[PDB]
């Protein structure tokens, strides 16, 4: 289990993208934009 | 303007068809059994084409 | 590994270090080589560019992993200390047009 | 599954070449040509 | 007249045989989860009336006969495919896949994956 104090002090954020099977992932790009 | 015009040889061969159809219809309206009018109209539309 | 999208849906996880500006990506539980470094005060929008080759294209998951606080905490100021992932109505997909 | 393992199956025989520059295969070409053949045949028919 | 294209003359290759083995693995897998969904009881004795059977064992473990009764229709399938003259090419990424060679046995979303139109027409002619 991750430390709750660590979760409180950290600033790193996460998300995810699930490419559904059969969707050609070469045609899929994931990341951040401004 | 969509495209697909007749070729030069197409035009040549159409004109040759015209000439030979005129030769065919020349002095043969009596030989044609009242279809001479049909050939007349044929050569007509050929002339406008 | 190859054919990761075949057996199961492929999962790309994007982690951003707002304190240092490091952007890293983890696919199938291992951190990919490509990483980015952004200058301070940058606003980064989660984004996916996809050419649909299937009726179902993809899925944004707003979950969280070990030692990383979920995206809603970063987005909303009220939930800055809420470990529970959230998808409030303000968050929504926008497409370029 | 063939697609999954990446095996591409294609047509049994690829086309060797299409003589599109040669205008003999035009629909007007062959049709009007047979038209001329029948016209000439009927012309010599009526000459007889 | 109900006649297909005879194909007894052609022989199957081995690079195609690896694909055949993988697709027979898939056939066994979906058959196994078909039995799980239906509720066939796991037991050494095989009785259809009692619904008991022992064949939920993995493909490599699986009986060679069962592997063979998958492989056979697959063999005549690729055999007729070659009788149609259709050439088959293994991609280099696919070759790398064979070279490379919890734990949930998961099938493949056949409906979600998509096929090209020419291959659709090939699917229709082979179906007929």
């Amino acid at each position: 289990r991750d430390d709750y104090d660590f979760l409180m002090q950290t600033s790193t954020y996460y998300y995810s993208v699930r490419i559904f099977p059969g969707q050609e992932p070469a045609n899929v790009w994931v990341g951040w934009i401004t | 303007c969509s495209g697909g015009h007749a070729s030069n040889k197409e035009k040549e061969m159409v004109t040759s068809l015209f000439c030979k159809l005129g030769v065919l219809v020349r002095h043969r309206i009596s030989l044609f059994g009242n279809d001479a009018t049909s050939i007349v109209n044929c050569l007509h539309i050929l002339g406008q084409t | 590994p190859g054919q990761g999208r075949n057996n199961n849906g492929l999962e790309i996880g994007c982690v951003v270090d707002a304190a240092s500006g490091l952007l890293t990506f983890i696919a199938n539980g291992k951190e990919l080589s490509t990483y980015y470094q952004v200058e301070p005060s940058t606003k980064l929008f989660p984004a996916v560019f996809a050419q649909a080759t299937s009726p179902n294209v993809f899925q944004f998951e707003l979950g969280r992993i070990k030692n990383v606080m979920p995206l809603s905490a970063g987005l909303f100021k009220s939930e800055h200390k809420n470990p529970v992932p959230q998808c409030p109505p303000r968050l929504h997909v926008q497409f370029l047009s | 599954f063939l697609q999954i393992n990446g095996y591409a199956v294609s047509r049994g025989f690829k086309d060797l070449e299409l003589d599109t520059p040669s205008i003999e295969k035009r629909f007007a070409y062959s049709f009007l040509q047979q038209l001329i053949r029948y016209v000439d045949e009927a012309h010599q028919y009526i000459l007889e | 007249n109900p006649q297909p294209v005879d194909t007894s003359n052609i022989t199957i290759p081995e690079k195609l045989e690896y694909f055949i083995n993988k697709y027979a693995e898939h056939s066994h897998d979906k058959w196994s989860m078909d039995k799980l969904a239906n509720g066939w009881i796991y037991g050494e004795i095989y009785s259809d009336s009692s619904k008991v059977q022992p064949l939920m064992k993995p493909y490599k473990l699986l009986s060679e006969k069962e592997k063979e009764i998958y492989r056979w229709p697959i063999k005549e399938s690729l055999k007729t495919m070659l009788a149609w003259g259709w050439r088959i090419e293994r991609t280099r990424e696919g070759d790398s896949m064979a070279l490379y060679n919890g734990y949930s046995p998961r099938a493949i979303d056949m409906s979600n994956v998509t096929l090209s139109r020419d291959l659709h027409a090939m699917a229709e002619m082979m179906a007929e």
Side-chain angles (χ1 to χ4, degrees):
Chain A
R1 168 173 157 297
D2 46 356
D3 176 41
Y4 205 80
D5 298 332
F6 194 88
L7 291 175
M8 296 319 83
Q9 57 95 50
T10 196
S11 81
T12 303
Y13 307 120
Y14 171 77
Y15 75 94
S16 46
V17 173
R18 169 177 324 276
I19 296 93
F20 283 105
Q23 168 55 51
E24 168 76 41
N27 288 30
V28 186
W29 287 270
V30 187
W32 306 79
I33 65 170
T34 77
Chain B
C1 184
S2 55
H5 47 293
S7 89
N8 178 251
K9 185 67 171 66
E10 293 294 329
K11 192 160 129 178
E12 295 293 328
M13 81 156 298
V14 163
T15 48
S16 67
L17 191 48
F18 176 77
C19 301
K20 291 182 285 188
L21 282 182
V23 163
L24 181 62
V25 74
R26 191 185 183 192
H27 324 313
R28 261 145 289 179
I29 71 177
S30 299
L31 283 76
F32 289 145
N34 307 118
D35 63 282
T37 56
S38 70
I39 295 89
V40 159
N41 297 336
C42 280
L43 183 82
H44 196 55
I45 196 65
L46 212 62
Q48 292 85 18
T49 56
Chain C
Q3 298 184 317
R5 61 95 174 175
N6 174 22
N7 58 8
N8 284 61
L10 189 152
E11 294 89 1
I12 284 174
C14 301
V15 289
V16 58
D17 200 25
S20 66
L22 210 52
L23 272 55
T24 44
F25 310 87
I26 53 171
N28 283 352
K30 44 153 181 63
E31 196 271 335
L32 313 166
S33 66
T34 60
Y35 79 103
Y36 295 113
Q37 170 65 43
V38 300
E39 65 183 1
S41 306
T42 308
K43 294 182 177 67
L44 302 150
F45 287 83
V48 174
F49 306 161
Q51 180 158 28
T53 71
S54 46
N56 318 306
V57 183
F58 68 93
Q59 202 182 70
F60 273 111
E61 298 178 353
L62 319 183
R64 66 175 278 269
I65 62 170
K66 178 67 177 294
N67 276 9
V68 193
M69 181 95 88
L71 187 64
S72 85
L75 289 188
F76 302 83
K77 306 142 183 89
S78 74
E79 317 304 303
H80 198 216
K81 291 300 143 282
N82 175 236
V84 176
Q86 286 175 19
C87 186
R90 203 163 172 207
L91 205 44
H92 56 248
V93 180
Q94 287 178 321
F95 81 115
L96 189 64
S97 159
Chain D
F1 209 87
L2 183 63
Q3 287 175 313
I4 293 168
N5 287 274
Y7 291 76
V9 70
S10 63
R11 179 69 191 94
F13 182 63
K14 299 294 188 292
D15 202 5
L16 61 85
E17 200 271 335
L18 275 165
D19 286 301
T20 46
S22 78
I23 58 173
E24 288 81 3
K25 270 73 71 179
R26 295 282 289 274
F27 160 78
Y29 201 100
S30 192
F31 174 61
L32 279 152
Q33 182 66 221
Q34 186 47 68
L35 277 190
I36 284 171
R37 269 85 60 84
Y38 284 146
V39 163
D40 295 331
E41 281 147 39
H43 176 229
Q44 61 94 25
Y45 281 161
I46 198 166
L47 290 176
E48 308 154 307
Chain E
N1 202 41
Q3 79 276 5
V5 175
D6 173 74
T7 182
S8 63
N9 63 7
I10 299 171
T11 178
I12 193 68
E14 67 277 13
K15 67 180 182 180
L16 281 71
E17 196 274 333
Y18 183 76
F19 175 75
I20 285 173
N21 164 67
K22 210 167 208 182
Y23 182 76
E25 292 178 353
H26 192 199
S27 78
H28 166 54
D29 211 16
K30 315 181 310 315
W31 181 65
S32 75
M33 283 74 74
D34 289 331
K35 301 304 151 214
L36 267 69
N38 296 348
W40 291 65
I41 304 167
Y42 192 15
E44 294 83 6
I45 185 65
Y46 171 55
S47 177
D48 298 80
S49 49
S50 165
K51 296 172 73 69
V52 65
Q53 55 82 32
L55 282 72
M56 295 299 102
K57 66 187 289 184
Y59 181 86
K60 183 49 85 196
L61 285 75
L62 183 63
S63 179
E64 70 278 17
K65 292 315 318 303
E66 189 70 25
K67 291 168 67 174
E68 274 151 21
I69 66 168
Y70 312 129
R71 201 175 302 266
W72 181 65
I74 299 180
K75 288 187 288 292
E76 291 85 5
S77 87
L78 282 72
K79 187 149 163 60
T80 313
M81 183 278 288
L82 297 162
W84 293 328
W86 302 350
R87 66 185 184 273
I88 188 167
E89 290 85 2
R90 181 63 173 269
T91 56
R92 291 283 76 82
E93 69 83 18
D95 274 286
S96 291
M97 289 313 42
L99 280 184
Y100 301 165
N101 282 292
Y103 163 62
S104 179
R106 176 77 187 132
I108 304 167
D109 56 356
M110 213 33 80
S111 69
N112 195 180
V113 194
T114 315
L115 186 72
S116 72
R117 317 294 88 73
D118 177 58
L119 296 178
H120 283 304
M122 293 180 183
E124 181 66 28
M125 59 187 79
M126 61 79 71
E128 72 183 14

